[PDB]
Amino acid sequence: MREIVHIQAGQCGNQIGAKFWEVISDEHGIDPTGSYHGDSDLQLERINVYYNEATGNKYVPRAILVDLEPGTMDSVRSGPFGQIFRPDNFVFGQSGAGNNWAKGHYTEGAELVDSVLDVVRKESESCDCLQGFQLTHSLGGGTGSGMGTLLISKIREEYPDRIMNTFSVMPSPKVSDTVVEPYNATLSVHQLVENTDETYCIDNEALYDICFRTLKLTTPTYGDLNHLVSATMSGVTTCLRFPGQLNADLRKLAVNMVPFPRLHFFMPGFAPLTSRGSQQYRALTVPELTQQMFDSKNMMAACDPRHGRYLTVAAIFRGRMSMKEVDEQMLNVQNKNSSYFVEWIPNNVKTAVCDIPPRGLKMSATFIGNSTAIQELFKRISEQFTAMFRRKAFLHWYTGEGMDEMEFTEAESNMNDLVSEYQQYQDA
Amino acid sequence: KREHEREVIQKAIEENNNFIKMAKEKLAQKMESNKENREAHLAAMLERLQEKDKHAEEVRKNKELKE
Numbered sequence: 001m002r003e004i005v006h007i008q009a010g011q012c013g014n015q016i017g018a019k020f021w022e023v024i025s026d027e028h029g030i031d032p033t034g035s036y037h038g039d040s041d042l043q044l045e046r047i048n049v050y051y052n053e054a055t056g057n058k059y060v061p062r063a064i065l066v067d068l069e070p071g072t073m074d075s076v077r078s079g080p081f082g083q084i085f086r087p088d089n090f091v092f093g094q095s096g097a098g099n100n101w102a103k104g105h106y107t108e109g110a111e112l113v114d115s116v117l118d119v120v121r122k123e124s125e126s127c128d129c130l131q132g133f134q135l136t137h138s139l140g141g142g143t144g145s146g147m148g149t150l151l152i153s154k155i156r157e158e159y160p161d162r163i164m165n166t167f168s169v170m171p172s173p174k175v176s177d178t179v180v181e182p183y184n185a186t187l188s189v190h191q192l193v194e195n196t197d198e199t200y201c202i203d204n205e206a207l208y209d210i211c212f213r214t215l216k217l218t219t220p221t222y223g224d225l226n227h228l229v230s231a232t233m234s235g236v237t238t239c240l241r242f243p244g245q246l247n248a249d250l251r252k253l254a255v256n257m258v259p260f261p262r263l264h265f266f267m268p269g270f271a272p273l274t275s276r277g278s279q280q281y282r283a284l285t286v287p288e289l290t291q292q293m294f295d296s297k298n299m300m301a302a303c304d305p306r307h308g309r310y311l312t313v314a315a316i317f318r319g320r321m322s323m324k325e326v327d328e329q330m331l332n333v334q335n336k337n338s339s340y341f342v343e344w345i346p347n348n349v350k351t352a353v354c355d356i357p358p359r360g361l362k363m364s365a366t367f368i369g370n371s372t373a374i375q376e377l378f379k380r381i382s383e384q385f386t387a388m389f390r391r392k393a394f395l396h397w398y399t400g401e402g403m404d405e406m407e408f409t410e411a412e413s414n415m416n417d418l419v420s421e422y423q424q425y426q427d428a
Numbered sequence: 429k430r431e432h433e434r435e436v437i438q439k440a441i442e443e444n445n446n447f448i449k450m451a452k453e454k455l456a457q458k459m460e461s462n463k464e465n466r467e468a469h470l471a472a473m474l475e476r477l478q479e480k481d482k483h484a485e486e487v488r489k490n491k492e493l494k495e
């Protein structure tokens with residue numbers, strides 16, 4: 001299986017989504033025209049995973065852009081790689097979702113969703129062998145969160161044997177738009193637990209902290225946060241995009257990473273951590289990459305890895321380096337810290353190497369972990385949800401769109417089940 | 429799930445229509461009760477003045493029937 005269909009929803013979804021296509025396009029040698037101007041053949045070998053060929057010979061991203069507002073999509077279209085997207089893959093309403101999950105999922109989103117599925121079907125039909133879908137969205141707003149999870153439900157109904165994966169941005173009070181973000185996040189998680197196969201948890205708390213503590217940026221913008229996201233995203237999709245042995249498609253990644261169907265929320269990690277523009281001149285040694293990629297301070301989800309156990313780990317090393325030194329360092333980490341890797345999944349750490357480094361670095365490592373420490377992320381959202389929900393505060397925004405309190409109670413309970421299910425395996 | 433989604437949007441339409449309905453009806457009862465009360469307050473004033481003309485007729489009557 002080859003083709004992945006990419007969907008980006010809402011302001012956050014479309015902003016990280018645009019950056020993703022920007023970064024991977026440069027790696028595959030594709031320019032704003034859709035014209036290849038690269039040297040290596042490794043660049044084109046698996047280009048069909050993400051790109052359509054339309055005679056030119058031009059490469060068109062298999063990408064559908066979705067919003068309930070036109071704003072951020074006009075931003076994308078007049079942005080750097082804006083011309084590359086298929087204009088018919090732009091699907092927008094006018095009325096917005098007002099950071100309201102109920103509007104995205106039930107009222108405004110319901111009005112727009114069929115048009116999105118027409119574009120999904122049109123893209124799915126040109127595929128030799130569709131692998132499945134990736135979605136970029138946030139959980140804190142209304143469109144990416146409410147409408148994004150509506151879309152996932154409808155995509156699963158029409159394609160139940162395909163893999164569904166998400167890059168899901170979790171909200172934090174540190175970088176926050178509205179007080180209702182915990183409501184929107186809890187309702188979205190409930191969906192994600194049932195209808196995705198694999199979810200990369202991108203924690204805005206973590207991205208903020210990395211920017212503040214490590215990159216010495218005193219006031220991080222979304223741009224700074226998204227630079228970390230696009231690097232992580234390029235990293236986690238390396239094995240899908242380039243010639244390679246393991247985690248080479250979406251189903252094989254799921255089979256190695258997900259021991260129990262509900263526990264499919266991954267903590268990504270990246271090394272070296274770099275800020276935008278400002279370059280680093282000294283390449284990292286393989287021992288340094290390996291130490292940094294496993295460091296809590298390189299994690300994109302604000303969870304302490306020492307507070308849990310790793311179920312499974314995938315590690316991707318990028319650049320020209322010694323594969324023998326990689327195996328040794330990877331083996332050294334596990335042997336040194338063996339109590340943090342569950343002993344009932346043997347050889348639960350898999351490593352891949354790709355020759356092509358990302359732009360502006362000679363060496364990089366990407367970490368994908370399924371840790372039971374992710375539970376800290378869900379506990380945090382749960383705490384914020386309950387603080388409001390016990391006084392039913394802000395609920396009228398949701399009941400006004402037809403929702404009952406019961407739906408909140410159920411979504412909370414399911415998220416608490418997920419928490420305690422993680423705790424079960426951290427002690428087994 | 430699709431049936432649940434249909435029910436939520438229907439609930440929302442129903443409650444919005446109920447609010448419009450009930451606001452339309454409370455306003456119409458208020459405008460009616462008010463028109464009636466204003467009218468009864470005026471009818472009573474006019475009646476009091478009617479009884480003054482009736483008393484003035486009767487007083488002029490009482491004058492002429494004395495010589």
Ligand SMILES: Nc1nc2c(ncn2[C@@H]2O[C@H](COP(=O)(O)OP(=O)(O)O)[C@@H](O)[C@H]2O)c(=O)[nH]1
Pocket residue numbers: 009010011012013015016097098099100137138139140141142143144145169170171172175176177181204207222223225226229
């Ligand atoms: N990391 C990141 N988070 C974002 C960005 N834009 C918005 N957010 C976060 O996304 C959430 C709000 O959702 P947003 O995508 O703006 O609303 P939507 O358009 O209705 O889906 C909040 O948690 C914001 O902190 C972005 O560009 N990057």
Ligand SMILES: [Mg+2]
Pocket residue numbers: 011012141177
């Ligand atoms: Mg927003």
